[PDB]
């Protein structure tokens, strides 16, 4: 299963950064969390995770994306970047 949420962060000013590390993968398409930033809005913020992947950002579709594209985006972006990730997989198992 996977849940899909809506995450916003704002920029205080037009240079900040959000905070994320962003990565591809060889073995499947679309861009991933791969960790947060120490201090950074996304850590403050507190609902990102490793693992998340980036489908769209402020209505522009990253499902095939690139971390290129996204910086794109994110650097062109208004104060406001809204940002919807899948999250998969189970949080807990036992093995």
């Given at each position: 299963?996977m849940?899909?949420?809506?995450?916003?962060?704002?920029?205080?000013?037009?240079?900040?950064?959000?905070?994320?590390?962003?990565?591809?993968?060889?073995?499947?398409?679309?861009?991933?969390?791969?960790?947060?930033?120490?201090?950074?809005?996304?850590?403050?913020?507190?609902?990102?995770?490793?693992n998340?992947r980036?489908?769209?950002?402020?209505?522009?579709?990253?499902?095939?994306?690139?971390?290129?594209?996204?910086?794109?985006?994110?650097?062109?972006?208004?104060?406001?970047?809204?940002?919807?990730?899948a999250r998969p997989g189970?949080?807990?198992?036992?093995?």
């Amino acid at each position: 299963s996977m849940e899909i949420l809506q995450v916003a962060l704002h920029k205080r000013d037009s240079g900040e950064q959000l905070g994320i590390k962003l990565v591809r993968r060889t073995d499947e398409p679309g861009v991933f969390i791969l960790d947060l930033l120490e201090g950074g809005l996304a850590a403050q913020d507190g609902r990102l995770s490793s693992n998340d992947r980036v489908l769209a950002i402020n209505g522009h579709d990253l499902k095939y994306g690139t971390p290129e594209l996204a910086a794109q985006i994110i650097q062109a972006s208004g104060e406001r970047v809204n940002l919807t990730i899948a999250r998969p997989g189970k949080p807990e198992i036992e093995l």
